């Protein structure tokens, strides 16, 4: 909302004004990664014991 | 599939209310409540100095 100021002359009257704006989210999806070696799974499943 | 939109914030501002006394230039004025001044048009302000 904006305040206004009275004057006296040919400069006009001042209506009270407003803005009422809206913004929009923009989204990024950011990535990490890691792998496991092939003979490292068979330790975890219990196949290689 | 679940899809939706949402609103996230309604931020408003407070109107900054000031009275005229709070400024520093309240010294230089002598503000008197003097009604019906425009109903006379005769310019006569006199005081003894």
């Amino acid at each position: 909302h904006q305040p206004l100021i009275a004057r006296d002359g040919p400069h006009p009257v001042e209506q009270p004004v407003h803005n009422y704006m809206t913004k929009v989210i923009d989204r990024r999806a950011l990535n990490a990664a890691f792998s496991l070696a092939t003979e490292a799974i068979a330790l975890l499943t219990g196949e290689a014991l | 599939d679940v899809e939706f939109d949402a609103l996230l914030g309604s931020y408003c501002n407070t109107l900054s209310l000031v009275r005229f006394l709070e400024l520093g230039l309240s010294v230089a004025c002598v503000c008197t409540k003097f009604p019906e001044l425009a109903y006379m048009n005769e310019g006569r302000v006199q005081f003894e100095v």
Binding site: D8, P10 | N41, E42, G43
Partner: protein, 299 residues
């Protein structure tokens, strides 16, 4: 009525306070319709545009521009004037001040230029703040359109001299138009602006078609219908002007546009559109000169 308040400037002389009282009912042309208006904006010095005080041409441009206003009540430090052109049709009855013709029960008055009569008549000049109010003359439309063509005719006889045009008898009025002693030297020099338009746009109007019709009808339905109406009426003066005077498409077509806008402006400058109407009630309906008349908004 949305009566816009014209502000008197700061203190004036006592004869200047009484002079603006007798203007109660004159016509005032306000440029904008702010509810607060100064009086210098109203005055004739605010009509100065080209660095000169205007003639009746420059007044009729300005009078066809800004908005009319009748002074309702004259107040201390304020003038309360309701404008004409705001409001719906036929609302807000108010009083005009009559000037010498009759202004009958109807007749649709026109707020037309002050120098159509004696030069410094009605020029209310405040000596204190040193400004000038030239109030215009409220005349009805057939009496408006007659006289504004009557004075521009007179300047032609003065523009190159050798019946007195200025009789114009009305229903009860023997209208003395001639102020011979000092005004006809000053009224003729003010239509110097308006005459030279009126001469040109005729001579640019006639001489264009005098070289159009020989260059047209020679390359359909234009030839059939136009000559069907001008059978020995304009063709009689076609042989008359081409013989008793002198005789290029591209200068002509570039002059076709230039005349038509200039001839179009004189339709708005002259011809004096009815601003307001008189329509009386409980009244004698035949208004004396200097008498108040009930006057309502739209034609």
């Amino acid at each position: 009525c949305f009566e816009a308040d014209i502000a008197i400037p700061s203190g004036i002389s006592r004869p200047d306070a009484a002079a603006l009282q007798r203007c109660e009912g004159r016509v005032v042309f306000l440029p904008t319709i702010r509810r607060q208006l100064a009086l210098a904006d109203v005055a004739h010095e605010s009509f100065v545009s080209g660095g000169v005080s205007p003639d009746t041409l420059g007044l009729l441009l300005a009078y066809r521009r800004r908005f009319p206003a009748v002074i309702t009540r004259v107040l201390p430090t304020r003038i309360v004037a309701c404008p004409v052109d705001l409001g719906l049709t036929h609302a807000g009855t108010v009083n005009l001040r009559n000037t010498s013709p009759v202004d009958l029960c109807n007749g649709d008055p026109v707020s037309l230029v002050p120098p159509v009569f004696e030069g410094q008549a009605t020029d209310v000049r405040l000596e204190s703040l040193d400004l000038t109010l030239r109030f215009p003359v409220p005349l009805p439309t057939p009496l408006a359109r007659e006289i504004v063509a009557r004075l521009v005719a007179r300047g032609i006889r003065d523009l190159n001299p050798d019946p007195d045009l200025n009789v114009l008898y009305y229903n009860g009025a023997r209208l003395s138009l001639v102020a011979d002693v000092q005004q006809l030297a000053s009224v003729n020099t003010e239509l110097r602006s308006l005459v030279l338009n009126m001469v040109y746009s005729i001579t640019e109007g006639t001489t264009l078609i005098l070289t159009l019709i020989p260059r047209l009808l020679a390359l359909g339905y234009v030839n059939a219908l136009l000559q069907m109406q001008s059978v020995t009426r304009e063709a009689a003066q076609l042989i008359h002007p081409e013989a008793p005077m002198l005789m290029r498409r591209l200068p002509l077509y570039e002059a076709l546009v230039a005349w038509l806008a200039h001839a179009g402006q004189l339709g708005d400058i002259l011809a004096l559109a009815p601003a307001v109407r008189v329509c009386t009630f409980d009244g004698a309906a035949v208004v004396q000169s200097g008498d108040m008349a009930p006057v309502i908004r739209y034609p």
